[PDB]
Amino acid sequence: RATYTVIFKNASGLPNGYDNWGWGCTLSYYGGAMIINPQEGKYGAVSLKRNSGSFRGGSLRFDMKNEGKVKILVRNSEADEKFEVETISPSDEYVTYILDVDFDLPFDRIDFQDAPGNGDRIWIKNLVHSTGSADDFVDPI
């Protein structure tokens, strides 16, 4: 049976138990979205750092709208190893994504990066991990 971990639903600030180790951007919160404002030329990203513990495999589910391509990554801090999950095409409307994480190590950071590096904004809501697969994801949101 999959275990679901809600990271944030509607965001009014950083999720409880997380820090932001991102770069090249600032975060703001409005309309229930975590909003990433990347700086042109920086290929900026939010990097949500889980302060206690790690996730293992499974899948990540989130709602996103985004002016440019967004690269999703995860990282293992002990090994300082990053793992690219997917790149997501621009959408002016929120879309729900459920993506398998095939990384062989635990992960404690989740990154959303401005892949083109032009400063395109990113809006995120309803970020949830499951220990199970994307195909098997029963959405608690």
Ligand X SMILES: OC[C@H]1O[C@@H](O[C@H]2[C@H](O)[C@@H](O)[C@H](O[C@H]3[C@H](O)[C@@H](O)[C@H](O[C@H]4[C@H](O)[C@@H](O)[C@H](O[C@H]5[C@H](O)[C@@H](O)[C@H](O[C@H]6[C@H](O)[C@@H](O)[C@@H](O)O[C@@H]6CO)O[C@@H]5CO)O[C@@H]4CO)O[C@@H]3CO)O[C@@H]2CO)[C@H](O)[C@@H](O)[C@@H]1O
19 lies in the binding site for ligand X (CB under 6 A): yes
Q: Select the span of 6-14, 18-26, 56-64, 92-100 touching ligand X (CB under 6 A).
A: 18-26
Residue type, 59: S
Distance of closest approach, residue 100 Cβ to ligand X, in angstroms: 22
23 lies in the binding site for ligand X (CB under 6 A): yes
Distance of closest approach, residue 47 Cβ to ligand X, in angstroms: 6
The interface mask with ligand X, positions 32-71, x = CB under 6 A, is -----------x----------------------------
Q: Which is nearer to ligand X, 43 or 94 (CB)?
A: 43
Binding footprint of ligand X, residue count (CB under 6 A): 4
Output the CA angle 64-67-69, nearest 5 degrees: 80
Give the DSSP letter string of the chain. Answer: ---EEEEESS-SSSPTTEEE--BSEEEEEETTEEEEEEPTTS--EEEEEESS--B-SSEEEEEEEESS-EEEEEEETTTTEEEEEEEE--EEEEEEEEEE---SS-B-EEEEEETT-S---EEEEEEEEESS-TTT-----
21 lies in the binding site for ligand X (CB under 6 A): yes
29 lies in the binding site for ligand X (CB under 6 A): no
83 lies in the binding site for ligand X (CB under 6 A): no
Distance of closest approach, residue 19 Cβ to ligand X, in angstroms: 4
Distance linking the first and last C-alpha atoms of the chain: 18
Q: Which two tokens stand for residue 119?
A: 């400063």
Which residues in this chain contact ligand X in the complex, by CB under 6 A?
19, 21, 23, 43
